[PDB]
Amino acid sequence: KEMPQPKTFGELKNLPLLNTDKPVQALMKIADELGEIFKFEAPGRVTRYLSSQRLIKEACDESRFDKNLSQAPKFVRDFAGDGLFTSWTHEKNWKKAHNILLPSFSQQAMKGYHAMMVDIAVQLVQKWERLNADEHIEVPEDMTRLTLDTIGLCGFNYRFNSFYRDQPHPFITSMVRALDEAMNKLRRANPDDPAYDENKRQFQEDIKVMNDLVDKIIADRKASGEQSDDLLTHMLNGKDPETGEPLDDENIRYQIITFLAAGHEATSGLLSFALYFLVKNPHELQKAAEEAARVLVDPVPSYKQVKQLKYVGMVLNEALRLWPTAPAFSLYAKEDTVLGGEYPLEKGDELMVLIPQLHRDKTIWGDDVEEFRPERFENPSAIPQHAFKPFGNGQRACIGQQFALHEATLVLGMMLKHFDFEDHTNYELDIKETLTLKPEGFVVKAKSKKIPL
Numbered sequence: 001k002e003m004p005q006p007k008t009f010g011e012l013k014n015l016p017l018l019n020t021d022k023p024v025q026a027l028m029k030i031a032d033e034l035g036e037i038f039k040f041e042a043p044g045r046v047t048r049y050l051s052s053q054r055l056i057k058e059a060c061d062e063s064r065f066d067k068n069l070s071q072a073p074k075f076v077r078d079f080a081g082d083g084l085f086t087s088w089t090h091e092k093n094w095k096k097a098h099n100i101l102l103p104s105f106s107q108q109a110m111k112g113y114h115a116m117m118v119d120i121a122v123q124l125v126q127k128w129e130r131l132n133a134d135e136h137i138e139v140p141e142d143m144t145r146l147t148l149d150t151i152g153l154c155g156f157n158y159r160f161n162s163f164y165r166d167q168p169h170p171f172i173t174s175m176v177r178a179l180d181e182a183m184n185k186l187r188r189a190n191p192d193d194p195a196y197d198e199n200k201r202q203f204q205e206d207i208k209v210m211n212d213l214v215d216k217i218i219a220d221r222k223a224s225g226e227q228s229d230d231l232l233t234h235m236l237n238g239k240d241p242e243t244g245e246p247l248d249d250e251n252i253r254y255q256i257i258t259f260l261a262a263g264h265e266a267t268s269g270l271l272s273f274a275l276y277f278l279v280k281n282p283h284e285l286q287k288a289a290e291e292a293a294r295v296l297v298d299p300v301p302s303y304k305q306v307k308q309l310k311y312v313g314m315v316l317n318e319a320l321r322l323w324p325t326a327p328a329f330s331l332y333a334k335e336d337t338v339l340g341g342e343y344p345l346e347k348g349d350e351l352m353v354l355i356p357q358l359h360r361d362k363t364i365w366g367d368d369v370e371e372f373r374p375e376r377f378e379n380p381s382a383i384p385q386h387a388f389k390p391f392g393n394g395q396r397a398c399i400g401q402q403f404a405l406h407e408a409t410l411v412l413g414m415m416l417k418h419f420d421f422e423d424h425t426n427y428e429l430d431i432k433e434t435l436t437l438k439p440e441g442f443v444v445k446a447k448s449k450k451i452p453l
């Protein structure tokens with residue numbers, strides 16, 4: 001069969017379609033019009049966007065397709081190096097770092113990070129406890145302060161002290177500006193136009209800022225010899241069972257930058273969309289709050305208590321279903337293959353999985369796919385393979401998944417234990433797109449339940 005393709009702009013092909021502030025949302029609209037697969041061409045390149053579980057399940061066959069670095073992660077690679085997110089499967093440092101780090105990221109490994117997660121969560125709750133009557137909460141802003149500080153404490157025992165600041169630590173400022181330069185580069189018509197000599201200079205400065213801090217901490221740690229409960233300690237002690245090698249210090253620095261750059265925002269966006277859905281759905285808020293009150297019976301939550309927050313984890317999954325915050329991933333065909341019995345592909349041909357549209361497949365979820373209903377996840381095993389994929393696929397799935405979910409369930413539990421919430425502005429959802437998705441401008445008021453920490 002011949003594939004549909006959205007509107008063209010002469011020699012620019014479909015490229016101007018992505019020249020917008022909200023390209024993923026634009027691509028979802030196109031998928032609504034064109035269906036489970038469409039061709040997307042730009043000068044010099046072609047990809048095919050997949051939206052159905054029928055075709056996505058084939059794309060997720062790792063014997064047939066492997067991760068592709070699309071343009072964004074290619075630009076992110078300029079500062080994240082050959083860290084796990086920006087490396088090809090066939091690079092020696094991807095398999096080395098995968099094998100060393102998968103055990104430091106498992107559900108069991110979360111017991112080790114739990115106390116430093118509670119440290120930063122307690123700072124968030126004390127913040128909101130200390131608001132005056134007339135004040136409000138800037139949700140994504142505070143959620144980013146929490147996840148950056150949590151990843152810096154668990155990753156390398158470094159305190160950004162985001163809740164002590166209006167201007168973030170210089171490393172955060174450089175990192176955020178670096179991710180922005182990377183994303184902006186996707187829409188830049190003439191990247192060598194002297195209008196960007198300042199943007200290129202700033203990018204190199206930002207690379208230098210991030211490198212210097214992270215190298216300095218690594219060095220500081222190797223010298224002291226201090227063992228901590230962070231990922232840096234595991235990375236200095238770890239050896240790949242396959243090669244027998246450890247990660248070198250350059251690659252360790254790249255992984256620390258990666259954890260921060262690639263993990264903080266998808267996680268803070270998750271928390272912010274989950275609070276959005278709960279304030280707009282007071283029956284589900286109340287159910288999640290009754291579970292938090294029933295389960296979090298101690299002044300600070302334990303690892304075991306967080307695991308008992310079943311309905312909070314359903315709310316988190318349902319927010320990921322409607323707005324998966326890391327919204328697409330790219331693949332390439334390892335060999336010639338026919339996709340879906342209908343679409344012949346050649347070795348090297350690219351696919352994109354458009355996650356929000358997968359998660360609207362009515363053949364899997366039913367007709368009410370736009371509705372927020374946590375109870376879809378009462379028994380997650382009922383969901384078919386490759387139907388719910390907010391964390392990617394296979395060996396190249398998110399290595400942060402259990403970290404993100406521990407963090408988000410711990411924090412949303414404490415928030416629901418400690419405050420009632422009001423959508424005092426009747427906020428209208430506005431989804432900003434960076435590397436990730438979040439509800440821009442989402443604000444709420446909290447009223448303390450006056451329960452001790």
Ligand code: HEM
Nearest residue numbers: 084085259263266267270326329391392396398399400404
């Ligand atoms: C709700 C939060 C998050 C979501 C939705 C998310 C989603 C994803 C997805 C979709 C990918 C696959 C990307 C691809 O195929 O190109 C991935 C990879 C990755 N994520 Fe996450 N992530 C989240 C949180 C995090 C956290 C907290 C960390 C680290 C502390 C993290 C670190 C990584 C890394 C290193 C990879 C690359 C893994 C590999 O390819 O070996 N992520 N993530």
Ligand SMILES: NCCc1ccc(O)c(O)c1
Nearest residue numbers: 262266326327328329435
């Ligand atoms: N750890 C998430 C990093 C990330 C960000 C955006 C995406 O589209 C993606 O596939 C992965």
